[PDB]
Amino acid sequence: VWKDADTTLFCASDAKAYETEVHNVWATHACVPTDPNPQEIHLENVTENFNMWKNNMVEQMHEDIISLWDQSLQPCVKLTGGSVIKQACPKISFDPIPIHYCTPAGYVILKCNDKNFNGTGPCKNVSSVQCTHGIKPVVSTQLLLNGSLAEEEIIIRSENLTNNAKTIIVHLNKSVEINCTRPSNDIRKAYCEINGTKWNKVLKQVTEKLKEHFNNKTIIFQPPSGGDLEITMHSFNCRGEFFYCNTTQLFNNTCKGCNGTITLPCKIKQIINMWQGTGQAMYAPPIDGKINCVSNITGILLTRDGGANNTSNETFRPGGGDMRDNWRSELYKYKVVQIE
């Protein structure tokens, strides 16, 4: 037997001693080797309750990535509320590795295997594990990149869909590749390429889903409605440089003559509004050469518009901000229980 519980966890990863990539370096000195012979035990006829939106694993993971980034990203200037900390800003090596989260002696992780699980509520196929799977801690906005895929249909996730303040995580079942380049030799201009057909058909499918959850209303996509660039743009980090990308072309409800390659305009930014805590950080101009990342779009962060009850439509805008949602998109199937 086992009661819901909250303990300190420990991490595991196959990081490399000689690799100077920051994620490996942090995982070398903060985690242990991954479990060599894992084994999950299936709890026969057991039904368990899960709550992805009220899970402490997420906060512990969040703290980890805040520390990783605090030890690894070295901005030339940092401007946190009166503080103006200055320091050398060498260009660093950057590429996330999977991180496992593991329970201490006396606790275990239950793993929801219900292929249509939405994150909250009950779960009939429950298995126990000592460690989560390898989770890449990919920091980004608007789009979830390089995560897992939904096992069956496209899953919709929300602490409470009725409430229009709580964010709507969409879990795709078919990844969409995003290919972003800063060509070699204005060195701050860059662009991401997406297959239109692939994208647009997926967005169609997403529309289907949202309609079912909203009395099959009219579903409208629009770009953010004000805010800072980290919010109005799809932001992420590629090879250490902060890419901001305009995603207006993706939320074009019109799509006809739009089945080709979608090129979204992007810029690398040196001054960013940080996500760890309040403050600004200045980095040095970008490295030379063809800076590129090819990534899987695996989920979308939506925020539904308020004050529409009295109409026949529901409009959604891409909506990042709280990184804890990124972690939630992989941790949704897990929960810690104190063993009895």
Ligand X SMILES: *[C@@H]1O[C@H](CO)[C@@H](O)[C@H](O)[C@H]1NC(C)=O
Ligand Y SMILES: O=C(O)CN1CCN(C(=O)N2C[C@H](CO)C[C@H](C(=O)Nc3ccc(Cl)c(F)c3)C2)CC1
Contacting positions for ligand X (CB under 6 A): 95-96, 113, 115, 118, 120-122, 125, 127, 138, 145-146, 153-154, 156, 158, 160-163, 173-175, 179, 181, 193, 195, 197-198, 205, 208-209, 232-233, 236, 238, 246, 248, 293-296, 309
Burial class (CB in 10 A: 0-12, 13-18, 19+), 216: exposed
By C-beta, is 42 or 86 nearer to ligand X?
42
Q: Applying CB under 6 A, which residues contact ligand Y? A: 139-141, 228, 230-231, 235-237, 242, 272-275, 277-278, 321-322
Cα distances (Å, whole numbers) of residue 146 to 52, 61, 79, 178, 294: 20, 17, 31, 10, 10
Residue 248 contact among ligand X, ligand Y, none, beta carbon within 5 to 8 Å by kind: ligand X
By C-beta, is 131 or 138 nearer to ligand Y?
138
- Structure token digits, residue 83: 């503080």
Residue 252 contact among ligand Y, ligand X, none, beta carbon within 5 to 8 Å by kind: none
**CA distance linking residue 133 with residue 12, whole number of Å:** 10
By C-beta, is 36 or 260 nearer to ligand X?
260
Minimal CA–CA distance to 186: which of 265, 128, 97, 257?
Answer: 265
Residue type, 81: G
- Shortest Å distance, C-beta 72 to ligand X: 14
Residue 179 contact among ligand X, ligand Y, none, beta carbon within 5 to 8 Å by kind: ligand X
- Structure token digits, residue 246: 């305009």
**CA distance linking residue 260 with residue 139, whole number of Å:** 28
Residue 141 contact among ligand X, ligand Y, none, beta carbon within 5 to 8 Å by kind: ligand Y
**CA distance linking residue 231 with residue 24, whole number of Å:** 29
Residue 163 contact among ligand Y, ligand X, none, beta carbon within 5 to 8 Å by kind: ligand X
Residue 242 contact among ligand X, ligand Y, none, beta carbon within 5 to 8 Å by kind: ligand Y
By C-beta, is 21 or 107 nearer to ligand X?
21
By C-beta, is 12 or 331 nearer to ligand Y?
331
C-alpha 125: how far from its chain's center?
Answer: 25
**CA distance linking residue 131 with residue 11, whole number of Å:** 8
Query: What letter does residue 304 receive in the DSSP assignment?
Result: E
- Shortest Å distance, C-beta 62 to ligand Y: 9
By C-beta, is 74 or 127 nearer to ligand X?
127
Query: What letter does residue 24 receive in the DSSP assignment?
Result: H
By C-beta, is 58 or 135 nearer to ligand X?
135
Residue 146 contact among ligand X, ligand Y, none, beta carbon within 5 to 8 Å by kind: ligand X
- Shortest Å distance, C-beta 119 to ligand Y: 19
- Shortest Å distance, C-beta 105 to ligand Y: 32
